[PDB]
Design a protein around this motif. Sequence first.
Motif, PDB file in Angstrom:
ATOM      1  N   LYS A 197      41.332  58.501  26.801  1.00  8.96           N
ATOM      2  CA  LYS A 197      41.885  57.460  27.659  1.00  8.96           C
ATOM      3  C   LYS A 197      43.398  57.361  27.489  1.00  8.96           C
ATOM      4  N   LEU A 198      44.130  57.668  28.554  1.00  8.33           N
ATOM      5  CA  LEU A 198      45.587  57.612  28.523  1.00  8.33           C
ATOM      6  C   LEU A 198      46.154  58.691  27.604  1.00  8.33           C
ATOM      7  N   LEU A 199      45.414  59.783  27.457  1.00  7.05           N
ATOM      8  CA  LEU A 199      45.843  60.890  26.608  1.00  7.05           C
ATOM      9  C   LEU A 199      45.728  62.220  27.347  1.00  7.05           C
ATOM     10  N   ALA A 200      46.828  62.964  27.390  1.00  6.69           N
ATOM     11  CA  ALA A 200      46.849  64.257  28.061  1.00  6.69           C
ATOM     12  C   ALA A 200      47.450  65.333  27.163  1.00  6.69           C
ATOM     13  N   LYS A 201      46.679  66.383  26.908  1.00  8.73           N
ATOM     14  CA  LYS A 201      47.136  67.481  26.063  1.00  8.73           C
ATOM     15  C   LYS A 201      47.099  68.804  26.822  1.00  8.73           C
ATOM     16  N   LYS A 202      47.942  69.742  26.407  1.00  7.36           N
ATOM     17  CA  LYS A 202      48.004  71.051  27.045  1.00  7.36           C
ATOM     18  C   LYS A 202      47.014  72.019  26.402  1.00  7.36           C
ATOM     19  N   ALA A 203      46.888  71.938  25.082  1.00  8.96           N
ATOM     20  CA  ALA A 203      45.973  72.802  24.348  1.00  8.96           C
ATOM     21  C   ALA A 203      45.212  72.019  23.284  1.00  8.96           C
ATOM     22  N   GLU A 204      43.939  72.357  23.104  1.00  6.46           N
ATOM     23  CA  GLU A 204      43.102  71.683  22.118  1.00  6.46           C
ATOM     24  C   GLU A 204      43.850  71.502  20.802  1.00  6.46           C
ATOM     25  N   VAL A 205      44.319  70.283  20.557  1.00  6.36           N
ATOM     26  CA  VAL A 205      45.051  69.977  19.334  1.00  6.36           C
ATOM     27  C   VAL A 205      44.173  69.228  18.339  1.00  6.36           C
ATOM     28  N   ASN A 206      42.910  69.632  18.253  1.00  5.53           N
ATOM     29  CA  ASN A 206      41.965  68.999  17.339  1.00  5.53           C
ATOM     30  C   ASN A 206      41.935  69.725  15.997  1.00  5.53           C
ATOM     31  N   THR A 207      42.818  69.318  15.090  1.00  2.00           N
ATOM     32  CA  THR A 207      42.894  69.930  13.769  1.00  2.00           C
ATOM     33  C   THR A 207      43.513  68.974  12.756  1.00  2.00           C
ATOM     34  N   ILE A 208      43.388  69.313  11.478  1.00  6.82           N
ATOM     35  CA  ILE A 208      43.938  68.485  10.412  1.00  6.82           C
ATOM     36  C   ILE A 208      45.281  69.026   9.933  1.00  6.82           C
ATOM     37  N   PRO A 209      46.245  68.115   9.726  1.00  6.23           N
ATOM     38  CA  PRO A 209      47.589  68.477   9.263  1.00  6.23           C
ATOM     39  C   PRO A 209      47.594  68.956   7.815  1.00  6.23           C
ATOM     40  N   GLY A 210      46.428  68.908   7.176  1.00  2.00           N
ATOM     41  CA  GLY A 210      46.322  69.340   5.795  1.00  2.00           C
ATOM     42  C   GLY A 210      45.025  68.896   5.147  1.00  2.00           C
ATOM     43  N   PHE A 211      44.233  69.859   4.688  1.00  2.00           N
ATOM     44  CA  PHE A 211      42.959  69.560   4.046  1.00  2.00           C
ATOM     45  C   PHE A 211      43.156  69.237   2.568  1.00  2.00           C
ATOM     46  N   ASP A 212      42.850  68.000   2.193  1.00  5.62           N
ATOM     47  CA  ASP A 212      42.992  67.563   0.809  1.00  5.62           C
ATOM     48  C   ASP A 212      41.628  67.393   0.149  1.00  5.62           C
ATOM     49  N   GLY A 213      40.583  67.853   0.832  1.00  2.17           N
ATOM     50  CA  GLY A 213      39.240  67.741   0.298  1.00  2.17           C
ATOM     51  C   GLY A 213      39.033  68.598  -0.934  1.00  2.17           C
ATOM     52  N   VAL A 214      37.921  69.326  -0.968  1.00  2.00           N
ATOM     53  CA  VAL A 214      37.606  70.191  -2.099  1.00  2.00           C
ATOM     54  C   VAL A 214      36.608  71.273  -1.702  1.00  2.00           C
ATOM     55  N   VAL A 215      36.778  72.464  -2.269  1.00  2.00           N
ATOM     56  CA  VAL A 215      35.891  73.583  -1.975  1.00  2.00           C
ATOM     57  C   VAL A 215      34.803  73.713  -3.035  1.00  2.00           C
ATOM     58  N   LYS A 216      33.581  73.985  -2.590  1.00  2.00           N
ATOM     59  CA  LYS A 216      32.451  74.138  -3.500  1.00  2.00           C
ATOM     60  C   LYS A 216      32.259  75.600  -3.888  1.00  2.00           C
ATOM     61  N   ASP A 217      32.368  76.487  -2.905  1.00  2.00           N
ATOM     62  CA  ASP A 217      32.208  77.917  -3.146  1.00  2.00           C
ATOM     63  C   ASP A 217      33.176  78.724  -2.286  1.00  2.00           C
ATOM     64  N   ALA A 218      33.406  79.973  -2.676  1.00  2.00           N
ATOM     65  CA  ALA A 218      34.310  80.849  -1.940  1.00  2.00           C
ATOM     66  C   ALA A 218      34.020  80.805  -0.444  1.00  2.00           C
ATOM     67  N   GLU A 219      32.751  80.977  -0.086  1.00  2.00           N
ATOM     68  CA  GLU A 219      32.344  80.958   1.313  1.00  2.00           C
ATOM     69  C   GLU A 219      32.902  79.729   2.027  1.00  2.00           C
ATOM     70  N   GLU A 220      32.740  78.566   1.404  1.00  2.00           N
ATOM     71  CA  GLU A 220      33.227  77.318   1.978  1.00  2.00           C
ATOM     72  C   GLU A 220      34.748  77.331   2.098  1.00  2.00           C
ATOM     73  N   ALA A 221      35.407  77.963   1.133  1.00  2.00           N
ATOM     74  CA  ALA A 221      36.862  78.049   1.129  1.00  2.00           C
ATOM     75  C   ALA A 221      37.370  78.800   2.355  1.00  2.00           C
ATOM     76  N   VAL A 222      36.588  79.772   2.814  1.00  2.00           N
ATOM     77  CA  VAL A 222      36.959  80.566   3.980  1.00  2.00           C
ATOM     78  C   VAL A 222      36.835  79.749   5.262  1.00  2.00           C
ATOM     79  N   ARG A 223      35.719  79.042   5.401  1.00  2.00           N
ATOM     80  CA  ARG A 223      35.476  78.221   6.580  1.00  2.00           C
ATOM     81  C   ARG A 223      36.587  77.189   6.763  1.00  2.00           C
ATOM     82  N   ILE A 224      36.901  76.472   5.689  1.00  2.00           N
ATOM     83  CA  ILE A 224      37.945  75.455   5.730  1.00  2.00           C
ATOM     84  C   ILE A 224      39.298  76.069   6.076  1.00  2.00           C
ATOM     85  N   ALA A 225      39.632  77.167   5.407  1.00  2.00           N
ATOM     86  CA  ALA A 225      40.896  77.853   5.645  1.00  2.00           C
ATOM     87  C   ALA A 225      41.086  78.151   7.129  1.00  2.00           C
ATOM     88  N   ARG A 226      40.132  78.872   7.710  1.00  2.00           N
ATOM     89  CA  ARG A 226      40.197  79.228   9.121  1.00  2.00           C
ATOM     90  C   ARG A 226      40.588  78.020   9.969  1.00  2.00           C
TER      91      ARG A 226
END
Length: 108
Positions: free
Chosen positions: A13-42
């Motif tokens: 509502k009242l928002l217009a974007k040119k390209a899907e800008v749905n992302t985080i400016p920085g992940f401060d969470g935590v990784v459980k396993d290497a595999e998970e580290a890859v998913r988050i990174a991407r």
Amino acid sequence: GSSGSSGDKIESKLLAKKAEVNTIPGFDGVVKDAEEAVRIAREIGYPVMIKASAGGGGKGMRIAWDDEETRDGFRLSSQEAASSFGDDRLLIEKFIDNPRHISGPSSG
């Protein structure tokens, strides 16, 4: 036989974007396993820096540029924290060589 329907259709509502800008400016969470580290990174967008949640410190940690690197670095980075502080809690932050934030696609 069927009957009944509904559709809110309420979003951006009242928002217009040119390209899907749905992302985080920085992940401060935590990784459980290497595999998970890859998913988050991407999601963050390579390159992606990997530090030890328990501690961290740019000087000592490792950085990954591809799923392959994310794992190789995660296996070690995680093992380090497991001896440094005790836990294997890792971290993943966005790495940008240039001081400018060009969030989006890139050559490869």
